[PDB]
């Protein structure tokens, strides 16, 4: 999933000197990571996440039906712990608890 | 000359793969690239003026040995 843009960063160490090389792999990196700038943007500039392939960090999870009625009521669990953060798919810079 | 004077053109048909770094039917390279077996059949003379040609070759191999050995393992940026 998220895990090749950990691949490409372990990948371009050894290449940070050569110049070809780092070029071809900090274009690759630049348009791979071009899909979770879309999801970043949209959920930092209206707060809705879309792409349903759980890809995301924040991770919005749906109320089961079962518990519908439950949640309603008691809204701020819903707003507390139906979001999370993804820590697998996290990169170095977002590995900050304040960010 | 030709009747008096025996030893194996030919000799440039197979050299511009020994140049390259790779074998050859009469050249062949022993003890991981660091020498080079001048055959029989090849005189005093053209030997010890391929000796200097040779030079290239071995050398050459050398530092594509190194090349391709140290590609992308090396972690410093200035080598």
Same mark, same amino acid.
């Not at chain 1, 071809?24 to 500039?45: E, K």
């Not at chain 2, 050459?60 to 391709?68: F, G, P, R, S």
């Given at each position: 999933?998220? &895990?090749?843009?950990?691949?490409?960063?372990?990948? +371009?160490? /050894? /290449?940070?000197?050569?110049? #070809?090389?780092?070029?071809?792999? #900090?274009?690759?990196?630049? %348009?791979? @990571? @071009?899909?979770? %700038?879309? +999801?970043?943007?949209?959920? &930092?500039?209206?707060?809705?996440?879309?792409?349903?392939?759980?890809?995301? +960090?924040?991770?919005?999870?749906?109320?089961?039906? @079962?518990? +519908?009625?439950?949640?309603?009521?008691?809204?701020? /669990? /819903?707003w507390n712990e139906?979001?999370? %953060?993804?820590?697998?798919?996290? &990169?170095?810079?977002?590995?900050? @608890? #304040? %960010? | 000359?030709?009747?008096?004077?025996?030893?194996?053109?030919?000799?440039? =048909?197979?050299?511009?793969?020994?140049?390259?770094?790779?074998?050859? !039917?009469?050249?062949?390279?022993?003890?991981?690239? =660091?020498?080079?077996? $001048?055959? !029989?059949? $090849?005189?005093?003379?053209?030997?010890?003026?391929?000796?200097? *040609?040779?030079?290239?070759? $071995?050398?050459? !191999?050398?530092?594509? $040995? *190194?090349?391709?050995?140290?590609?992308?393992?090396? *972690?410093?940026?200035? !080598?």
């Amino acid at each position: 999933g998220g &895990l090749l843009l950990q691949v490409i960063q372990e990948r +371009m160490v /050894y /290449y940070k000197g050569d110049p #070809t090389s780092l070029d071809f792999l #900090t274009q690759l990196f630049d %348009i791979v @990571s @071009s899909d979770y %700038i879309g +999801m970043l943007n949209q959920w &930092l500039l209206e707060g809705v996440i879309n792409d349903p392939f759980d890809e995301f +960090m924040i991770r919005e999870k749906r109320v089961p039906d @079962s518990f +519908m009625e439950i949640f309603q009521s008691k809204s701020e /669990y /819903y707003w507390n712990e139906l979001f999370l %953060i993804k820590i697998d798919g996290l &990169l170095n810079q977002f590995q900050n @608890s #304040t %960010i | 000359i030709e009747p008096y004077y025996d030893t194996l053109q030919t000799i440039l =048909t197979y050299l511009p793969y020994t140049m390259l770094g790779s074998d050859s !039917k009469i050249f062949t390279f022993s003890n991981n690239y =660091t020498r080079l077996e $001048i055959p !029989k059949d $090849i005189n005093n003379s053209f030997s010890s003026l391929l000796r200097e *040609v040779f030079e290239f070759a $071995i050398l050459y !191999k050398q530092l594509a $040995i *190194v090349v391709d050995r140290y590609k992308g393992t090396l *972690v410093s940026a200035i !080598k």
